Design an enzyme around this catalytic site. Sequence first.
Site, PDB file in Angstrom:
ATOM      1  N   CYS A 165       0.805  -1.217   0.000  1.00 45.06           N
ATOM      2  CA  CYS A 165       0.000   0.000   0.000  1.00 45.06           C
ATOM      3  C   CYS A 165       0.838   1.267   0.000  1.00 45.06           C
ATOM      4  O   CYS A 165       0.302   2.339  -0.292  1.00 45.06           O
ATOM      5  CB  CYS A 165      -0.902   0.021   1.232  1.00 45.06           C
ATOM      6  SG  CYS A 165      -1.504  -1.610   1.714  1.00 45.06           S
ATOM      7  N   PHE A 188       0.934  -3.229   3.832  1.00 48.26           N
ATOM      8  CA  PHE A 188       1.112  -4.580   4.346  1.00 48.26           C
ATOM      9  C   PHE A 188       2.580  -4.982   4.277  1.00 48.26           C
ATOM     10  O   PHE A 188       3.262  -4.748   3.277  1.00 48.26           O
ATOM     11  CB  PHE A 188       0.242  -5.558   3.555  1.00 48.26           C
ATOM     12  CG  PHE A 188      -1.233  -5.288   3.680  1.00 48.26           C
ATOM     13  CD1 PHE A 188      -1.880  -5.459   4.895  1.00 48.26           C
ATOM     14  CD2 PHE A 188      -1.973  -4.857   2.590  1.00 48.26           C
ATOM     15  CE1 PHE A 188      -3.236  -5.213   5.020  1.00 48.26           C
ATOM     16  CE2 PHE A 188      -3.330  -4.605   2.707  1.00 48.26           C
ATOM     17  CZ  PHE A 188      -3.962  -4.787   3.924  1.00 48.26           C
ATOM     18  N   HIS A 222      -9.328   1.504  -2.019  1.00 48.38           N
ATOM     19  CA  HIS A 222      -7.925   1.151  -1.867  1.00 48.38           C
ATOM     20  C   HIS A 222      -7.406   0.617  -3.199  1.00 48.38           C
ATOM     21  O   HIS A 222      -7.985  -0.320  -3.758  1.00 48.38           O
ATOM     22  CB  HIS A 222      -7.773   0.116  -0.751  1.00 48.38           C
ATOM     23  CG  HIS A 222      -6.373  -0.044  -0.247  1.00 48.38           C
ATOM     24  ND1 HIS A 222      -5.290   0.584  -0.825  1.00 48.38           N
ATOM     25  CD2 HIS A 222      -5.880  -0.765   0.790  1.00 48.38           C
ATOM     26  CE1 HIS A 222      -4.191   0.253  -0.170  1.00 48.38           C
ATOM     27  NE2 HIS A 222      -4.522  -0.565   0.813  1.00 48.38           N
ATOM     28  N   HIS A 233      -3.833   7.251   5.970  1.00 48.72           N
ATOM     29  CA  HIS A 233      -3.898   5.977   5.267  1.00 48.72           C
ATOM     30  C   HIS A 233      -5.327   5.449   5.256  1.00 48.72           C
ATOM     31  O   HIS A 233      -5.842   5.042   4.208  1.00 48.72           O
ATOM     32  CB  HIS A 233      -2.947   4.975   5.916  1.00 48.72           C
ATOM     33  CG  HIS A 233      -2.780   3.709   5.136  1.00 48.72           C
ATOM     34  ND1 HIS A 233      -2.491   3.699   3.790  1.00 48.72           N
ATOM     35  CD2 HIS A 233      -2.867   2.411   5.514  1.00 48.72           C
ATOM     36  CE1 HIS A 233      -2.400   2.449   3.372  1.00 48.72           C
ATOM     37  NE2 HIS A 233      -2.621   1.647   4.399  1.00 48.72           N
ATOM     38  N   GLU A 275      -3.256   3.793  13.162  1.00 49.34           N
ATOM     39  CA  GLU A 275      -2.902   5.102  12.623  1.00 49.34           C
ATOM     40  C   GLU A 275      -3.255   6.213  13.604  1.00 49.34           C
ATOM     41  O   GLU A 275      -2.525   7.206  13.713  1.00 49.34           O
ATOM     42  CB  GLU A 275      -3.590   5.329  11.279  1.00 49.34           C
ATOM     43  CG  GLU A 275      -3.231   6.660  10.640  1.00 49.34           C
ATOM     44  CD  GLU A 275      -3.617   6.747   9.179  1.00 49.34           C
ATOM     45  OE1 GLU A 275      -4.573   6.057   8.766  1.00 49.34           O
ATOM     46  OE2 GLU A 275      -2.964   7.516   8.443  1.00 49.34           O
ATOM     47  N   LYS A 325      -9.894   7.110   1.096  1.00 49.43           N
ATOM     48  CA  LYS A 325     -10.357   5.765   0.776  1.00 49.43           C
ATOM     49  C   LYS A 325     -11.827   5.569   1.115  1.00 49.43           C
ATOM     50  O   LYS A 325     -12.417   4.574   0.681  1.00 49.43           O
ATOM     51  CB  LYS A 325      -9.503   4.721   1.500  1.00 49.43           C
ATOM     52  CG  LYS A 325      -8.048   4.677   1.030  1.00 49.43           C
ATOM     53  CD  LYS A 325      -7.237   3.648   1.805  1.00 49.43           C
ATOM     54  CE  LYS A 325      -5.843   3.480   1.202  1.00 49.43           C
ATOM     55  NZ  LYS A 325      -4.974   4.660   1.494  1.00 49.43           N
TER      56      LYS A 325
HETATM   57  C1  LIG Z   1      -7.612  -2.205  -6.858  1.00 48.23           C
HETATM   58  C2  LIG Z   1      -7.360  -3.577  -7.480  1.00 48.23           C
HETATM   59  C3  LIG Z   1      -6.116  -4.246  -6.898  1.00 48.23           C
HETATM   60  C4  LIG Z   1      -5.898  -5.646  -7.463  1.00 48.23           C
HETATM   61  S1  LIG Z   1      -4.239  -6.262  -7.033  1.00 48.23           S
HETATM   62  O1  LIG Z   1      -3.814  -5.774  -5.723  1.00 48.23           O
HETATM   63  O2  LIG Z   1      -4.269  -7.712  -6.839  1.00 48.23           O
HETATM   64  N1  LIG Z   1      -3.080  -5.824  -8.209  1.00 48.23           N
HETATM   65  C5  LIG Z   1      -3.024  -6.436  -9.523  1.00 48.23           C
HETATM   66  C6  LIG Z   1      -1.821  -6.371 -10.249  1.00 48.23           C
HETATM   67  C7  LIG Z   1      -1.736  -6.941 -11.514  1.00 48.23           C
HETATM   68  C8  LIG Z   1      -2.868  -7.590 -12.067  1.00 48.23           C
HETATM   69  N2  LIG Z   1      -3.067  -8.216 -13.245  1.00 48.23           N
HETATM   70  N3  LIG Z   1      -4.318  -8.683 -13.330  1.00 48.23           N
HETATM   71  C9  LIG Z   1      -4.962  -8.373 -12.215  1.00 48.23           C
HETATM   72  C10 LIG Z   1      -6.416  -8.720 -11.907  1.00 48.23           C
HETATM   73  C11 LIG Z   1      -4.054  -7.655 -11.354  1.00 48.23           C
HETATM   74  C12 LIG Z   1      -4.141  -7.074 -10.065  1.00 48.23           C
HETATM   75 NA    NA Z   2      -3.232   9.155   2.787  1.00 44.62          NA
END
Ligand SMILES: CCCCS(=O)(=O)Nc1ccc2n[nH]c(C)c2c1
Ligand code: NA
Lengths: 414, 414
Positions: free
Chosen positions: B169, B402, B343, B309, B320, B338
Amino acid sequence: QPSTANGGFPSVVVTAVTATTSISPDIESTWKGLLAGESGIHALEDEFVTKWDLAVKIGGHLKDPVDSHMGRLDMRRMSYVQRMGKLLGGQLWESAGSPEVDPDRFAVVVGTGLGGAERIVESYDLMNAGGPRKVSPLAVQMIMPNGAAAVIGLQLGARAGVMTPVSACSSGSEAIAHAWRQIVMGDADVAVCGGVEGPIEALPIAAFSMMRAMSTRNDEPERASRPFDKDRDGFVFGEAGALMLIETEEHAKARGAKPLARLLGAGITSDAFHMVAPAADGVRAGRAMTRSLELAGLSPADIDHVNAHGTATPIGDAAEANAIRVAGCDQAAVYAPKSALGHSIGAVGALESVLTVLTLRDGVIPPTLNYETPDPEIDLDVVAGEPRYGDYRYAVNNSFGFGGHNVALAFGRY
Amino acid sequence: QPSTANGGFPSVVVTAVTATTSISPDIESTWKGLLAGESGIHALEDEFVTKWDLAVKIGGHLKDPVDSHMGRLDMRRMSYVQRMGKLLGGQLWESAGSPEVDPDRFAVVVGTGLGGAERIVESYDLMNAGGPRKVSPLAVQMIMPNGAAAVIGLQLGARAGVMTPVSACSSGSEAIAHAWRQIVMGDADVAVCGGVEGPIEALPIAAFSMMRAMSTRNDEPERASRPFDKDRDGFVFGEAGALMLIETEEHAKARGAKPLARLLGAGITSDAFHMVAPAADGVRAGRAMTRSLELAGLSPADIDHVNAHGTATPIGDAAEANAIRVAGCDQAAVYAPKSALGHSIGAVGALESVLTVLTLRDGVIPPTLNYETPDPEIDLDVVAGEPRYGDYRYAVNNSFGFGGHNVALAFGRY
Ligand SMILES: CCCCS(=O)(=O)Nc1ccc2n[nH]c(C)c2c1
Ligand code: NA
Ligand SMILES: CCCCS(=O)(=O)Nc1ccc2n[nH]c(C)c2c1
Ligand code: NA
């Protein structure tokens, strides 16, 4: 302008090193093997070589596999790079005398090329079989690329920063560069830094060898990695992981630590030229060498030794030759350890940084294996045949990763 | 000891910002929506929600999908984060007046949470079907986590360094922190920095929601993200990507650039407490705030605004709250974006850094959505109901990722 020589930067020294390689699990045994002309590159005995009939059939697996030190608990709650990070972090601390430092002045910077990628497919398959609830609650902390560094920071208690730089072949060197920055800027007094990387398997070989980046000399495994040689045809995989302990000279003397070398400066530039190929030009790669000299307080004449990137790709070795000449270090004694240890991507910059420290401590450079017919347009002082003993006072380790990331670390003998 | 105030560090300013969010593809339209109390979190209309019957059925997809700006060529030679990086990098440069800077003084630092991970499975399947030669020669440059930053550096011509920090994050904030370091240490005069991150899909939801880290309030999508509220039950996914342009004040005045804010300092510490949970204590997270003040030259009384955060997890918001109090900034006006934007992991620190700059420029803080019943043991000045207009002179943006990675960026109004 501040530098290491004029006192603008606090003196930082290397006090402990650890590495697992295709030659030995002990860094000192690896060093001895390198001097005896040993190679870690053999014929791959894994079944995935014959299962896919890969063009590349050679490589160097770790002499002592990581998982042979891993019980059932560690095998299911950590990715590979995390398990390697934990084992190396534990060995490094014991080698340093298990010192008790201030956690708030203790940083960790560990680079890697990819992360816990094999856990992505495991959670991919576990969800297809039993649904979303068959995914482990530990999947996030195993998959995240910062996981290896986070494991090491948690195990050693580092609270002045835990960082994971990613820049392909330069990840391990860049981690040491940022750890040095973290100390000279006052954020930390002691830091564990290096790089970890996963093992050799079919898809990594397929992806890199379709770029025609890998050697296909499967008949003679140990003669395949030929940095700066005319008969070179790409790099060879060699598994590795490496960490070193750096700290201010004041911090080292206050705990009775015998430093192995001095970490003087670090230069990070980029090519902005091509996604995988280095600039044949070599200006920006040489500028990273020059930048590390400016921060160290040195001149190119002070550089007695260059631990080259030397992947043995046709284009890469030529680009580095121009880079070394652009930086004005063409008279230095060059070593290409990937001739014997192969390429470990995210870890190799850290491993070669350790070899650079060892070269400065013992005043000796191992021979570049398979350097028999020097390429005419590469005119460098490549140490070959036998180890060359010499008065090496300052050395520069080079890392030029895919993506155009150039890291140069300037080291000095203590 | 050097700082921004005493002149030990060159003054660095923010001159351009760009972001794509669940509210709008334009950062100024996103800002307007945030002030009008809009939310980007809706009911997920994708089929993977009903295919797996996920516990989480809410989230914020990008208002304008990245691939709607991507032709066939871009769709097969770049991972998602690379495509988002290219689109954002292009929009940022045009917004900055398309300046012509020295490539050797131009750096790029773009964080991300994972990388081009979806291309790993594609090459995994392509090899199972047609063998090792059905893997694209572009697989390496698409998979490598440094790929997004490398694409942006190559597109914009940045040759003073291309770096990819990974810290969950805090990746997006840490990227800005390293870009600031790269400039104040003399390695660069201008830098593009921020974070990109992939989209919402089934496995990401499964992995994070098995930690009980996500909200399950599927009946009222926009009321689910409740930072510092008593009825909070975790975070909500909200896709985002964000980049900003920072440069020395001298560099900005020499090209006629109107700066939006001042980047004053950055503090990076670590918890070394737990692989996913933050230290309930909050000392190290607060120390990152304090460290950013030391480098800025400020005191906790100067801090008028904290962009928290605020993930809305029970444990995170409490940690926090202690962190803000430990740093001595408990009197500042707190915003948790957020609540409205969700997020975005590797990108959210960058996005919230842009919101922090916008808050300082316009002297207004958007309301924290769903802040109705303040939690008794969280006593903070949480802006709610309507935007609060105020004399905000210095602000701190918080990112606690994290793994225990704490990044704090200190911003000042120009
Ligand atoms: C706000 C959504 C966060 C999802 S995530 O944290 O798992 N990040 C990623 C990174 C690459 C990726 N390729 N295909 C997918 C679905 C991905 C997801
Ligand atoms: Na912030
Ligand atoms: C010297 C060998 C380099 C191979 S690599 O470059 O493809 N790196 C990684 C990283 C994580 C991994 N998990 N499982 C595997 C096989 C991995 C490989
Ligand atoms: Na080297």
